[PDB]
């Protein structure tokens, strides 16, 4: 008895219905309320300057053409009928390649409340477009936007909203971080207006705020360069007569800084300016360069070729520029570390 | 109200033919085009192309769709576009392109009372370039986008940039990570063939490559390794292991820089301008250890059969030679 009335309601919905045109095309603006549930904020590619996110994307809008009367108050349609009802063309302004899933059935729900207010809760996967300012690599933070609006319809035709308080509408799942590089602090929900060539559009916005973890770069990139510079300054406490030892030392510490430089620049998008890591590596490379130049200035003033014996003709003294550089270079490197780590942990 | 609008759409699309050109026997239809570039995603020097996301919009006045009695512009659902006429426009530079499909497929049909119809498409296309990478990384590229009608000739269809020099917008929004856009030009022309003259448009760019990054990564350490090669000149000839360790560890470091810039840079197997600079620096570092071979064979070999002359001469010759090399390089390419 109930299924008979149900199939009669299903048959007599779409009689005289037209899915080509907006509900109230001359009457009112069509208010569409929107809810988002992020199940995973997937992995953020720095080379492509993009990110991946998975959402359940709930919509709701009142359609006068789909009132009904029956036993129940709420319906649940096929996608065969959800392709036969007007549905607002919500595209994503920064989408690169996005997928509406259909395993196993198409992931589309359409509820009809008995007043005619639809509820259309589909499940997506969004490969978005977050432009990154990388002056402060890797000690930086930036916002990544998720921005949707209607495509064909203007502000005069379709106006979007949120289903709740706006900061509570976009809900990230608790186990839905799914990042290794960055660290999601929180979202910021907003609403805005574009001026395209075709008219003003209501454009929603969710920002996602991301700070990069820096422990990997302190272990891999910063500390080996620091210890290499510490070695290049250390060599001064070898004696002035051991020319091949300090020579091999200086040139191969420059080779070590070369290896660290190229391996640190490899794992990074090829931006066209000076990242903070590039400043650090270049100045450390300059220190290891200046150490070997200082040893050359030591070697030019040697006058002798043999070592001081362990018991006592003349001998060499420790050169004065050795005693100068032993105080000079670690002080300059410590001053540069204070300036660097005080400048770039502040922004 | 709404019933009149529904009856109006039903009688506009009553008996419509989706194969007739507008004014099928009369004049050619004018299609005015319009692009809002969202972004340029990647510029791949390996694959010689670029990925271009835009809003490709068209205008043509179709007198089979002119309504009356309604003041508002009829913006229909995008699924009426399978029931209309559209131009057969394609992209000559294209490799692989797609109208986006989330959440529904991105079209718009915005009708007008005289019969003008807007046709919008959010297209992420991939357009090819022929790249002159012989001056890499000091090049200026010229990447285009070539739009052409497919079946209709210019007797049937006409393409113009709607607005002259201000059709294509949003190029100033583009912030490429390694390029910098000098200039975009807009070209409209009919292309004479043997089969018939076809219309063509041409969006184009110019991409000046940004060069301070390679000063950071690639040029500066080769310069400093080249200068550290010279340190053997201010060492006594008796210290053999020091000058040999200098020259040998220096050519080893140049080998590592050349190999990991063979691996780091985009891989395009012909002669570039960073390759000439790195190989020239490798030649200078090689000559600066041929110098020690020259010194050791003259003193310790041709002794019984000057050293400060050769060293004092090389200390003046090699910086002048390397500065002349930098002069020739950075004025011949720039």
């Amino acid at each position: 008895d109930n299924t008979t009335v149900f199939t009669r309601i299903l048959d007599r919905l779409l009689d005289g219905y037209d899915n080509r045109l907006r509900p109230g095309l001359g009457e009112r603006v069509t208010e569409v309320k929107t809810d988002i549930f992020v199940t995973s904020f997937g992995p953020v590619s720095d080379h492509d300057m993009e990110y991946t996110i998975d959402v359940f994307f709930r919509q709701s809008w009142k359609d006068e053409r789909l009132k009904f009367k029956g036993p129940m108050t709420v319906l649940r349609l096929n996608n065969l009928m959800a392709s036969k009802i007007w549905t607002p063309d919500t595209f994503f302004h920064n989408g690169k390649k996005s997928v509406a899933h259909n395993m196993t059935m198409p992931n589309k729900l359409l509820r009809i409340t008995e007043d005619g207010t639809l509820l259309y809760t589909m499940r997506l996967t969004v490969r978005a477009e977050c432009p990154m300012h990388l002056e402060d690599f890797p000690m930086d933070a930036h916002a990544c936007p998720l921005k949707f609006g209607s495509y064909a319809y203007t502000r005069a035709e379709v106006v979007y909203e949120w289903t709740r308080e706006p900061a509570r509408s976009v809900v990230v799942a608790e186990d839905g971080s799914r990042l290794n590089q960055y660290d999601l602090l929180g979202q910021t929900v907003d609403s805005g207006i574009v001026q395209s060539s075709t008219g003003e559009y209501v454009v929603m916005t969710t920002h996602f705020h991301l700070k990069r973890k820096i422990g990997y770069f302190v272990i891999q990139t910063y500390l080996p360069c620091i210890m290499t510079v510490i070695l290049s300054q250390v060599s001064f406490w070898l004696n002035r007569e051991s020319v091949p030892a300090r020579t091999v030392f200086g040139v191969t510490t420059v080779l070590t800084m070369t290896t660290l430089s190229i391996s640190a620049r490899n794992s990074l998008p090829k931006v066209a300016y000076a990242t903070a890591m590039d400043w650090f590596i270049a100045v450390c490379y300059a220190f290891v360069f200046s150490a070997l130049i200082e040893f050359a200035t030591v070697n030019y003033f040697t006058k002798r070729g043999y070592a001081w014996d362990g018991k006592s003709k003349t001998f060499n003294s420790v050169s004065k520029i050795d005693r100068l550089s032993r105080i000079a270079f670690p002080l300059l490197f410590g001053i540069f570390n204070l300036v660097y780590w005080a400048t770039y942990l502040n922004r | 109200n709404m019933s009149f609008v529904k009856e109006t759409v039903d009688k506009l699309l009553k008996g419509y033919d989706i194969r007739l050109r507008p004014d099928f026997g009369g004049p050619p239809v004018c299609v005015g085009m319009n692009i809002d570039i969202a972004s340029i995603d990647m510029v791949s020097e390996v694959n010689m192309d670029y990925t271009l996301t835009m809003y490709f919009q068209q205008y043509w006045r179709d007198k089979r769709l002119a309504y009356s009695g309604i003041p508002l512009n009829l913006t229909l659902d995008n699924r009426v576009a399978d029931q209309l006429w559209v131009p057969d426009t394609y992209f000559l530079n294209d490799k692989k392109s797609f109208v986006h499909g989330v959440t529904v497929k991105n079209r718009m049909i915005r009708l007008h009372p005289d019969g003008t119809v807007l046709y919008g498409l959010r297209i992420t296309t991939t357009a090819a370039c022929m790249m002159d990478l012989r001056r890499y990384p000091l090049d200026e590229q010229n990447c285009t986008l070539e739009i052409e009608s497919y079946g209709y000739t210019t007797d049937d269809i006409e393409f113009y940039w709607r607005g002259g020099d201000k059709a294509v917008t949003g190029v100033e929004r583009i912030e490429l990570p390694q390029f910098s856009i000098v200039e975009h030009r807009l070209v409209s022309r009919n292309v004479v063939f043997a089969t018939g003259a076809y219309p063509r448009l041409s969006l184009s760019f110019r991409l000046k490559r940004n060069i301070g990054y390679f000063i950071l990564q690639t040029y500066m350490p080769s310069i400093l390794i080249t200068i550290l090669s010279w340190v053997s000149f201010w060492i006594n000839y008796d210290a053999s292991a020091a000058r040999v360790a200098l020259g040998i560890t220096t050519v080893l470091t140049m080998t590592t820089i050349n190999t990991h810039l063979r691996e780091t840079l985009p891989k395009i197997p012909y002669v570039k301008a960073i390759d000439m600079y790195l190989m020239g620096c490798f030649v200078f570092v090689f000559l600066a250890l041929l110098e020690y071979a020259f010194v050791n064979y003259i003193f310790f070999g041709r002794g019984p059969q000057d050293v400060n002359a050769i060293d004092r001469w090389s200390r003046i010759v090699f910086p002048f030679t390397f500065s002349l090399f930098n002069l020739v390089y950075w004025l011949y390419y720039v």
Partner: nanobody
Framework: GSLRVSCAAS????????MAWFRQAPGKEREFLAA???????YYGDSVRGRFTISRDYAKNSVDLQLDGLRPEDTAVYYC?????????????????WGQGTQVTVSS
């Protein structure tokens, strides 16, 4: 009446940066007015929504606030701002570049 207040920039290409206008009455309160994104999106303050209009010239690197229908209570200093707003678009601790501030005095 009407007013048009611009804000030129130099030293940096701000094409990718969210530029804004603020307002500070005597009372030490930096109120958000308007902001245009890199993707041309106008965000507006809540108290001033629909009255004013923000626009940018992305080539000449400037932001332009068009003033419209001025109350006498629109009497304050107008602060140009730029940034890449982090916990942003409404909060003064997101913008890291600032204008010199311009007094606008309106009475009846």
């Amino acid at each position: 009446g009407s007013l048009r207040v611009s804000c030129a920039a130099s030293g940096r290409t701000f094409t990718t940066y969210i530029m804004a206008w603020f307002r500070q009455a005597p009372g030490k309160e930096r109120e958000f007015l308007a902001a245009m994104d890199q993707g041309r999106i106008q965000y507006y303050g809540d108290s001033v929504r629909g009255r004013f209009t923000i626009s940018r010239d992305y080539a000449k690197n400037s932001v332009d606030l068009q003033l419209d229908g001025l109350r006498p209570e629109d009497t304050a200093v107008y602060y140009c701002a730029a940034g890449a707003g982090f916990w942003g678009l409404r909060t003064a601790s997101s913008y890291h570049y600032w204008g010199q501030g311009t007094q606008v005095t309106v009475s009846s």
